[PDB]
Amino acid sequence: MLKIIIPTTMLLPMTWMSKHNMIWINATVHSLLISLISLSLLNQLGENSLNFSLTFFSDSLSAPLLVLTTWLLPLMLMASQSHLSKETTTRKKLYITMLILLQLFLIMTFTATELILFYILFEATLVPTLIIITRWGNQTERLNAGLYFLFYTLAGSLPLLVALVYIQNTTGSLNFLIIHYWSHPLSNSWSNIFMWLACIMAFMVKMPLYGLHLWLPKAHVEAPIAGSMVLAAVLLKLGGYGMMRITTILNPLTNYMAYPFLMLSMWGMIMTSSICLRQTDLKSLIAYSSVSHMALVIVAIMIQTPWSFMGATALMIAHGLTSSMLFCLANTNYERVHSRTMILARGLQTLLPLMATWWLMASLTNLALPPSINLIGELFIITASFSWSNITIILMGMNMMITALYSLYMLITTQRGKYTHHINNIKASFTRENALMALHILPLLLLTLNPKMILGPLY
């Protein structure tokens, strides 16, 4: 894994020692080359994981996420170029360094073979994200959003640290391979119940769960474009990755303990999709849609069936791409009109035609038009839940309908109608923004042709 890690680390000295003109160019070029290197990890032996070393391993679950992060870094730099132009060279380099540290931490989290190291790196991501949000946000609420994000995540995580240390003491090892191979069943005792809660709750917080999702809207709304992109695409997926990894330890109690979170996620998906219908801010609407899709992912993980896990992996990747693209599309309008109110900018299809097509494709993926990977994941999850209970179809179908409604309502309001007369600052879309949208869309559409890559280990 050092083939990827070491170059990512060298990205920092290059960025710091690069000329003021050339920071973005060098960062983008070398990040893209690193992403190209990451594509080698997609080749996964079916039976066994790629155990590169004692510290690091990759499987059919970690590989797609690593590729996603490496891909995301250059898109994040491209998106963040515009609003950081006025910033001084040192601050721009610090922002790029925060992004690079975040990528390094995420890669090590995904490839780490020990749960304690995974915890250290997974919590470590808070610092760069917190710094980004609270230093390069454009609103007074960036500080409160940072406090909420940090404290929600830490309150979830710390009991996880206690539980992991206890597991290390009892089983004797926190290496995932040994844990999987031995994996003695849990007993239905209050102590084991609370251990299950401690293990699950941190990832339940990271993956916005209904009742623990309040941090996500504030953080995504108040964060800069790059921070929103990472939070939606990758940081949420850390919870899913950990929950899929951690579920091995808690085999039997999961059936008994799943019902509260299963019900919360299933009803919350409807609740948040309905929330999206009446939201007045584009970023907030995108965030709530993210919440709903991650609720679908949570249901898939809790059910603990192979098809559900494959759907969860596919949905994680597809949603990361789609939500990042949606945030970037909203950010372009925000830069042009300097407001996140949906009503303020209208009829943008006439003014900016190609951005309208980008919006259409992003919304279609959001509403799971087949054969999109979004639909593949959602359909697999839906079938697994149908096996879990035939009555599940009602809520899932209602959620599908509400998702289509809110996605196309966003598209109609922002990109359709008569243009807002007074707004005169709309200017022809730059090649950079269209290139960012295309870089988002094309990999998602291409991944449909070969869907085994994003279908996870159980495939």
Binding site: I25, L39, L42, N450
Partner: protein, 98 residues
């Protein structure tokens, strides 16, 4: 209440100074080379070369190997009259029941 500079006007359009801005910077040369770097190293290299690399990635998932083994097993079992799939994953004798 304070001596603060007037809010800067909306950042000057890069088009005004350079009509073919391409974005990516104020200086036109860096704009062109940034666009070229992005387009080459993502579209031409990562998407096309990377997509080809994924498409022809060697089948270490053993799908064809599994299919060939299944064909052999099906032919043998049908020829010998043995059931196509045995109900017991592991041989009963080795198991010692309580």
């Amino acid at each position: 209440i304070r001596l603060q500079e007037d809010p800067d006007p909306e950042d000057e359009n890069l088009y005004e100074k350079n009509p073919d801005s391409h974005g990516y910077d104020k200086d036109p040369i860096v704009d062109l080379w940034n666009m070229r770097v992005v387009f080459f190293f993502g579209f031409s290299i990562v998407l096309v070369l990377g997509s080809t690399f994924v498409a022809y990635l060697p089948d270490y998932r053993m799908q064809e190997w599994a299919r060939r083994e299944a064909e052999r097993l099906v032919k043998y079992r049908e020829a010998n009259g043995l059931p196509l799939m045995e109900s017991n994953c592991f041989d009963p004798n080795k198991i010692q029941l309580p």
